[PDB]
């Protein structure tokens, strides 16, 4: 018998659109934005971390009734303006992107006419409060030393207060309940990629050339990774809003409207259909 009958389609209940697309955990999202320890009616910020194949997306997101709003954004392709040209999806690029997002938030808020009610009711016995937010990375499974915690570590080092533990940073030991700072510092300046570069060059030279063809072509060495990464963090902390121009073709917004309208397929009318 055919199970997909008129009765099955009549009582069929569709899920949410993003749940069918596999992009949103609506169970975790409801606990994110409708639950709070305190009831002071304060706004809440969530740091959204997403990872693609060639880019890292970090956003500062507020949740409203009609849709989410973005406060600030940092990208791994903006790290090209900061000197980071290869390895845009490793742990070091994620931590630099999280550091860049933290500096952009502080520069936008002025912590690096219209005025707030906090300044209106400010008491003389009051100090500057750090910017507080919670982490949201979505559906990505995370083991110890995940790259989404580098975005957490970069944002926390930049000046964003995120409540967190240290049990998932690279170098942590479950048995001793301790975190190895040397392994963490090795991950900070890209020593794990540098160790892979030296190990591959000693063992399999053909595999070393295939995986790191861009590093050899642009003359990026394993020993110079620590200097290159540390110089990028200084430049991020100095100029948080450096403009980046990519190598993609550049046109105006109206020109992209006309180009896509030429390549768009119009829907057939009632008379034609």
């Amino acid at each position: 018998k055919l199970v997909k009958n008129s009765a099955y389609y009549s009582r069929f209940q569709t899920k949410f659109k993003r749940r069918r697309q596999g992009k949103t955990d609506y169970y975790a999202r409801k606990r994110l934005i409708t639950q709070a320890k305190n009831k002071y009616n304060a706004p809440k910020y969530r740091l959204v971390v997403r990872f693609t194949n060639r880019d890292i997306i970090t956003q500062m997101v507020t949740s409203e009734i009609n849709g989410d709003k973005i406060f600030a954004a940092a990208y791994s392709h903006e790290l090209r303006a900061y000197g980071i040209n290869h390895g845009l999806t490793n742990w070091a690029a994620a931590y630099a992107t999280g550091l860049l997002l933290a500096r952009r938030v502080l520069a936008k808020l002025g912590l690096d006419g219209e005025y707030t009610l906090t300044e209106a009711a400010e008491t003389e016995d009051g100090e500057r409060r750090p910017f507080k937010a919670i982490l949201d990375v979505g559906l990505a499974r995370t083991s110890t030393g995940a790259r989404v915690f580098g975005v957490m570590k970069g944002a926390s080092d930049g000046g964003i207060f995120i409540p967190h533990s240290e049990n998932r940073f690279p170098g942590y030991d479950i048995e001793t309940e301790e975190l190895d700072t040397e392994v963490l510092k090795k991950y900070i300046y890209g020593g794990h990629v540098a160790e892979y570069m030296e190990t591959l060059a000693d063992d399999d030279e053909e595999r070393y050339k295939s995986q790191f063809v861009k590093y050899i072509e642009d003359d990026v060495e394993a020993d110079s990774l620590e200097e290159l990464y540390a110089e990028a963090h200084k430049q991020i902390r100095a100029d948080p809003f450096r403009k980046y121009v990519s190598d993609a073709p550049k046109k105006s917004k109206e020109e992209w409207k006309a180009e896509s309208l030429k390549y768009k397929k119009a829907k057939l009318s009632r008379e034609e259909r």
Partner: protein, 244 residues
Amino acid sequence: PRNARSKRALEKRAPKIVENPKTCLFLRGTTCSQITQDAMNDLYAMRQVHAKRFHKKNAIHPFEDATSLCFFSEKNDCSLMVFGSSNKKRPHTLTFVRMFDYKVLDMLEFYLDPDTYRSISQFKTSKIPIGMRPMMVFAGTAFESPVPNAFTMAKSMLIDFFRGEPSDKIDVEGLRFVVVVTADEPQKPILRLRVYGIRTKRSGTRLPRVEVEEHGPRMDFRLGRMREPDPAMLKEAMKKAKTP
């Protein structure tokens, strides 16, 4: 209550001295207009945290028989109710129902003006975050009647709808949205529901200068049929339990 989760749900549904925040049920009748459905979706947007929604049609007339309301209120633990229906005599009706002890306390019908209804999507402003309660401003001469009437009944119902969660303290940043209801005494007066976003400016003094901008839905209502509570159960409803 052998199951621990079922026992916890029974204790949550049990009466308490300090009551839980009230839950509103949004249910649709057999015949309903799209304007009433959009108004129901707009009212659900301000109360996403403490509401449940029904997606099917119900053959219920609230002013004839309300046994199904008491069954839905008992099952879903909902004390507030918004009921939408359409008719030739009443084109767009929002039936607000408030319950007490899983029984119908009071109901009121709201006739929505179709030509002056604008939704939240039609206003391109910054919207309210989900979970934040707005402040309330009630203006007009129809809310201070010496006798209990429908406008005072609608004032208490709109207060309960936008009450949110009680709190002894509040942040200054959570005072950026206000809900304004205007209704004047008198042919039928028009109850106008306005929601505004609040911007603060320097005025040279300690107190800031308040500026408003339209945020929420532009709703115009006319009060219709009203069911007043029985005074014996009304007296039990206003009994104020002393907090320990």
